[PDB]
């Protein structure tokens, strides 16, 4: 009682202070400036909404004695929020429930009491036409239920709160979404609620209802409005199709919405990865390593263990499917020590020419690659290992017996070591012939690749690219010329005085 | 006092990393550690060391004497400012804040040194403070702070000639350029070996001589070796005191290849033992091998492989797996034949390999401005 | 010692002699510009990345 009585009373006192400045000002500008004013010019309440996501992702942890998040829901649910004669008393209602929390006991939201914190959209002049108010102020109690997730009688409360959110969502899906960002703001709010929806209502439940429901939500997209539902409803379409095994990958080939048109460097950024693993499981032909690389270079300053570890893995998984390999562990941050062992230990064996060393990796960490599910792509690397071997030995030795190369490559059989090497000519990994009667394999000395018109092509790939980065550095920098607007000639009165002094010099 | 101070950190290396070697280093490291007021730098060297349970009075007597020096600085400052000389507080701790630099950590050093830097209007103390910052940044390998006071030093090497502050500085650029794997710059900073002096940090001048020959034998080609290190009397008479190193250099120049491996495992083995080399001994001799292969193999075209075992160094299959791993490594320009037992070489033109490094650096800087172009404009 | 260059044969003692002055002047002079501009962009971190 003294330690809780001194340390527990400031928590309400703090956060309520910052929460009368983040989402009270967002309550003033997001509803008063998007439901009534334009928000395409001023949509800063969406990045402010990102701030009021990132505060509350790490804001609540405890089961809330002293009613410091559990007393917010008796406070913040009595919200008409219609107009200033009805919200000027709501500003008092941000203060009266402080007297309810401190003077009295409020209602302790501990896994039982969320339902009287839910049934507010009917009473106290609460409405739904201000879905800037009811979507943000739906999500803001829809979050901290599912933020801790506290898997104990919080899945149906979450669920019914998501049902009220689905009622607001139907009012968005059918009810007057024109030019207000009623649809567009609730594609961010819909988008974020698809994740808690998808954290408690995907793996527990049957996302497959939200497959066809997601075809409805995507169906009303691209017809009426053409942004931000084009973005989220396709990765959110993808994330269990990858996880599962639907045919939508060629659906994603024939899809129109493969562009969502500058989707804000989160959905646009990760979207390239989510379509990268598509052609990974549909046989990388070096096509998507540029978009894996692009998805890596479009990612922010958050951490690597979110997904940047995974794109850092798969991105040169597929380059190991090619044959080229860079160095990977060279930035020992929050991942280039922790998650690299089996993987750098794999490519360590791949950069060698040894055959069963690959097996010495694969038995050692087959289950670890099965923990990522990459194992069905790891299994096919023996082709690339023997390409490394035949390129290595075919580059090193000139006139070598086939009765040595299977022995060095531990292939156990010269009689098809004719045939692996034979395919290695037949594809194009090596040129010259084999005296199959004798046994020696000769290789010609192919030098002067300089005059062999090729590094011109290695140039011409890059000349056009550097002209493109120059021209984009022209196109995205002509903004500056603005504000300042008058370049006066010299003056007016000094021109008149110049006429007077010139008239006196002419009179002289 | 930082003039004997490098042996301390070298013996921290010698205590820590050779795991078998853990007795005499914690003997003599203690011999210098629990005397001369060293207090801060050995708590985690004590973690790597044993418990040493009763260190408490050993701490308290030395932070007690440290408290005595601290409080007599605190007795110095007020009579210092009372009748003023050249701001005699910072004239006191421009001598005793280096005591606090050895004894205390780098912070009580650095705020007193950036403090006292604004006092001495002539560089004759400024550049020595900069040398102290160079030495402690060498100790804690402050790889960004050395880049600062190197240039900040060099800005004060202009006015005057100050070749005891320029040739002295070239030693520091040489030791950092051999800390990093920058060998052709390292011997180039180790060019002189004349104005280099009976220093505090290589108290043997001949240890500096061993260092500059070990880097020079990679860093320069035969034309230079056959003029510079072979005809230098000042470099010759000090390796005249060396039986092994004089043999080690002359085995390569005098085409004595088989004993060159014998001395090579000695020099590489000691380099494996060596602090501030030990990061790159595995890079050293893998270059020495392919360099020695270049020197012998670029004489003939039709040299067989079975000549090199008895003539060069034993082990035919070792020469097989060695050479290949180098033709396979894209260097060592030849093309070995197998089932007639001969080694054939070529000559490459300086047009494809000179192209290769250009596509390396071009793709690298394209990645660079590509990345920064992603950084700006969100 | 490279005062002379060519090759020496061991089969019968034949000195095949050959020479051309290669293009040294172009690619390395273009190359050190690249390592200048690397340091330039490293300075652009010190006026762009920290700044805005």
């Amino acid at each position: 009682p003294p330690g809780g009585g001194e340390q527990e009373p400031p928590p309400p006192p703090a956060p309520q202070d910052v929460e009368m400045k983040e989402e009270a000002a967002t309550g003033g500008g997001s509803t008063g400036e998007a439901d009534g004013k334009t928000a395409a010019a001023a949509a800063e309440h969406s990045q402010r909404e990102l701030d009021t996501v990132t505060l509350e992702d790490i804001k609540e942890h405890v089961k809330q004695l002293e009613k410091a998040v559990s007393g917010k829901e008796p406070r913040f649910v009595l919200r008409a929020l219609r107009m200033l004669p009805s919200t000027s008393r709501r500003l008092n209602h941000y203060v009266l429930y402080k007297a309810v929390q401190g003077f009295f006991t409020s209602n302790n939201a501990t896994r039982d009491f969320l339902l009287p914190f839910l049934e507010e959209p009917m009473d106290t002049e609460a409405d739904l036409q201000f879905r800037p108010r009811t979507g943000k102020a739906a999500s803001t109690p829809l979050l901290p239920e599912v933020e801790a997730y506290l898997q104990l009688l919080v899945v149906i409360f979450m669920m019914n709160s998501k049902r009220y959110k689905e009622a607001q969502k139907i009012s968005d899906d059918l009810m007057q979404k024109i030019s207000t960002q009623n649809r567009r703001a609730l594609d961010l709010v819909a988008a974020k609620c698809y994740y808690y929806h998808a954290r408690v209502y995907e793996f527990l439940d049957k996302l497959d209802v939200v497959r066809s429901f997601l075809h409805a939500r995507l169906r009303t997209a691209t017809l009426r409005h053409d942004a931000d539902g084009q973005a989220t409803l396709l990765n959110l379409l993808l994330r269990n199709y990858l996880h599962y095994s639907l045919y939508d990958q060629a659906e994603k080939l024939v899809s129109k919405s493969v562009f969502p048109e500058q989707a804000n460097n989160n959905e646009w950024a990760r979207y390239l990865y989510y379509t990268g693993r598509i052609k990974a499981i549909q046989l990388e032909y070096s096509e998507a390593r540029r978009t894996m690389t692009n998805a890596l270079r479009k990612a922010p300053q958050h951490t690597a263990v979110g997904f940047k570890q995974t794109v850092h893995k798969l991105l040169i998984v597929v380059e190991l499917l090619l044959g080229e390999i860079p160095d990977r562990l060279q930035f020992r941050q929050p991942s280039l020590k922790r998650s690299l062992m089996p993987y750098f230990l794999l490519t360590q064996a791949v950069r060698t020419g040894n055959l069963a060393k690959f097996n010495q990796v694969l038995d050692q960490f087959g289950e670890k690659f099965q923990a990522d599910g990459t194992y069905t792509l790891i299994i096919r690397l023996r082709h690339n290992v023997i390409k490394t071997g035949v390129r290595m030995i075919s580059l090193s030795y000139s006139r070598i017996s086939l009765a040595d190369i299977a022995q060095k490559l531990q292939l156990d059989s010269p009689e098809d070591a004719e045939f692996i090497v034979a395919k290695a000519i037949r594809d194009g990994v090596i040129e010259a012939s084999i005296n199959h009667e004798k046994g020696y394999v000769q290789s010609k000395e192919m030098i002067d690749i300089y005059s062999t018109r090729e590094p011109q092509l290695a140039f011409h790939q890059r000349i056009s690219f550097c002209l493109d980065i120059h021209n984009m550095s022209v196109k995205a920098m002509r903004f500056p010329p603005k504000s300042y607007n008058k370049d006066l000639e010299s003056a007016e009165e000094r021109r008149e005085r110049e006429q007077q002094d010139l008239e006196f010099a002419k009179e002289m | 006092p930082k003039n004997p101070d490098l042996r301390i950190a070298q013996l921290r290396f010698l205590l820590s990393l050779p795991e078998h070697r853990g007795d005499a280093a914690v003997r003599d490291e203690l011999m210098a550690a629990v005397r001369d007021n060293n207090m801060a730098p050995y708590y985690e060297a004590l973690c790597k060391s044993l418990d040493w349970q009763i260190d408490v009075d050993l701490l308290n007597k030395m932070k007690k004497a440290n408290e005595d020096e601290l409080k007599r600085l605190d007795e110095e400052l007020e009579d210092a400012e009372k009748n003023l000389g050249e701001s005699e507080i910072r004239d006191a701790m421009m001598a005793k804040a280096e005591y606090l630099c050895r004894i205390g950590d780098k912070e009580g050093a650095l705020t007193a040194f950036r403090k006292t830097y604004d006092k001495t209007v002539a560089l004759g103390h400024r550049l020595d403070i900069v040398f102290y910052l160079l030495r402690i940044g060498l100790f804690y390998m402050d790889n960004d702070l050395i880049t600062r006071n190197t240039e900040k030093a060099k800005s004060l090497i202009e006015e005057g000639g100050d070749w005891d502050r320029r040739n002295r500085l070239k030693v520091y650029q040489g030791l950092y350029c051999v800390a990093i794997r920058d060998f052709k710059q390292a011997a180039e900073l180790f060019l002189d070996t004349v104005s280099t002096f009976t220093s505090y940090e290589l108290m043997d001048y001949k240890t500096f001589v061993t260092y500059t020959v070990y880097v020079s034998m990679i860093a320069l080609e035969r034309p230079d070796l056959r003029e510079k290190v072979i005809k230098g009397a000042e470099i010759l008479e000090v390796l005249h005191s060396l039986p092994a190193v004089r043999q080690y250099l002359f085995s390569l120049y005098e085409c004595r290849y088989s004993v060159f491996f014998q001395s090579l495992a000695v020099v590489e083995q000691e380099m494996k033992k060596d602090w501030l080399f030990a990061p790159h001994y595995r890079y050293y001799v893998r270059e020495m091998r392919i360099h020695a292969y270049s020197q012998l193999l670029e004489s003939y075209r039709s040299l067989t492989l079975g000549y090199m075992a008895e003539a060069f160094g034993v082990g035919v299959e070792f020469i097989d797996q060695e050479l290949s791993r180098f033709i396979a490594a894209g260097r060592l320009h030849c093309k070995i034949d197998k089932v007639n037992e001969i080694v054939e070489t070529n000559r490459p033109d300086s047009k494809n390999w000179q192209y290769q490094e250009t596509i390396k650096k071009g793709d690298l800087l394209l990645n660079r401005v590509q990345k920064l172009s992603r950084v700006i404009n969100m | 010692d490279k005062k002379f260059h060519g090759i020496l044969d061991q089969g019968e003692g034949v000195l095949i002699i050959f020479d051309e002055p290669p293009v040294d002047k172009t690619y390395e002079a273009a190359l050190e510009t690249i390592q200048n501009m690397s340091k330039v962009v490293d300075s652009l971190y010190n006026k762009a990345k920290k700044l805005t």
Partner: peptide, 30 residues
């Protein structure tokens, strides 16, 4: 390749010269 390679760095440096111009103009001017 070298000339086009330097040209882009030049225009990028002008973009930084533009950013510094508009930013330290928005808060100062208003």
């Amino acid at each position: 390749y070298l000339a086009s390679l330097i040209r882009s760095v030049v225009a990028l440096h002008n973009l930084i010269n533009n950013k510094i111009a508009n930013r330290d103009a928005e808060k100062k001017e208003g």
